[PDB]
Design a protein around this ligand. Sequence first.
Ligand SMILES: O=C(O)c1cc(-c2ccc(Cl)cc2Cl)ccc1O
Ligand SMILES: O=C(O)c1cc(-c2ccc(Cl)cc2Cl)ccc1O
Lengths: 112, 115, 115, 112
Amino acid sequence: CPLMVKVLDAVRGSPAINVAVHVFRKAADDTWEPFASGKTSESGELHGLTTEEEFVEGIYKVEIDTKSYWKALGISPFHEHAEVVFTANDSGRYTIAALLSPYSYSTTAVVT
Amino acid sequence: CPLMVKVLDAVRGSPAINVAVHVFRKAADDTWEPFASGKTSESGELHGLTTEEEFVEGIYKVEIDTKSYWKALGISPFHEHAEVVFTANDSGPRRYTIAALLSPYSYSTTAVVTN
Amino acid sequence: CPLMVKVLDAVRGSPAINVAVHVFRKAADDTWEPFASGKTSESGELHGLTTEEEFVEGIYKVEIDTKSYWKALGISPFHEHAEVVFTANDSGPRRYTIAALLSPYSYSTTAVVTN
Amino acid sequence: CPLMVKVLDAVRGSPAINVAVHVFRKAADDTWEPFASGKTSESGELHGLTTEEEFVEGIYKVEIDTKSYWKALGISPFHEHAEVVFTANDSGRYTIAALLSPYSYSTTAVVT
Ligand SMILES: O=C(O)c1cc(-c2ccc(Cl)cc2Cl)ccc1O
Ligand SMILES: O=C(O)c1cc(-c2ccc(Cl)cc2Cl)ccc1O
């Protein structure tokens, strides 16, 4: 797995389960084209987005539907979603992690 | 101001100065329209983006140009930028502070909304 | 002030008001000695903890009573408190801002140090 | 494993390796007594601190030597260490995660 996403809930201290995640890659006309998508597991993880074959150098956007997550819990959150945008410069594994709260989120990249 | 942006640097323990910020508003033809832009001050703050009159209900995107910030300090960070997307003023006028704390491979954002 | 503390609430999108804060200084008999304490204001800030004269070089511990904060809002959080321990003024006098962003099972802290 | 610690480096986007971690449990005279310790692995993880037998209800302190980590990298950091203090109320697995930067850290508890 060259690309994994992991989502945590900072309020309840749990994985954030069943969170929709959409991945886009930048096209040569500077528009976003769908690339991969999924829902986080019981462990708050999403694997199997891509193969190494398909995950070439490029600019990618990882969109996490945080709003639906919080609304399902009876909480009116601040953000519409959380978006993580990065170049994969693949030269010399990417884990995109997000930690969520209703009015706040943090994200880090672990690249190994 | 009804909309303020504050940016801190987690590596240097400092305000993040001269960070470019672009604000867009969703135009319901569903494209992002330019709304306001500016650069953070020596205190890492950006005020004067808009007036209460102009800051109507809508979905807004605050784009913080983190990459140009780290690169200007001569290094190569992970993210292209940090974006914060939210609905504003949908239960009437509020004051919004969008805060960001930056590291080369990580950032945090939070909103302070007062009435 | 040479030492200020600011606390935000990530669940409510608000300053964290009336949070108790205790500051201690290591006494080199190696016990923590009381230094200053206070409660955050309606803006989530705490000033007036010390003077430049009294804030000498040393190792300081800033203890933020997060548990009493969440419990006062009627819930049961994970941490007992959030502590921030640092050496101060060891390359001469600086101004320190200790900031914390709080959730029931998580917190973040950062320092802004200016000259 | 009832207690795991995981440490990440927010600057470099990597696990924080070889970081010393000391765990204390509160004694009945309101003093801290050593409980468990270790160094993070190549994956930035520390397991095998405790058994379920030994990990009874109590107040625990997890101390992460962040200062040595940053100094070894040629960076003068702000904090002496990062301390995480919590009651384990074990009634109905604890993962203590920390994300580090020279002047900042975040910590979250994932309790499953
Ligand atoms: O902001 C983050 O994505 C973050 C992520 C963290 C993790 C650490 C370790 C693991 Cl396995 C997963 C996650 Cl989401 C810890 C703290 C954080 O602030
Ligand atoms: O996540 C943030 O953007 C953040 C923002 C913080 C602030 C607190 C107070 C002020 Cl005035 C400004 C900022 Cl950026 C403190 C900690 C944080 O983690």
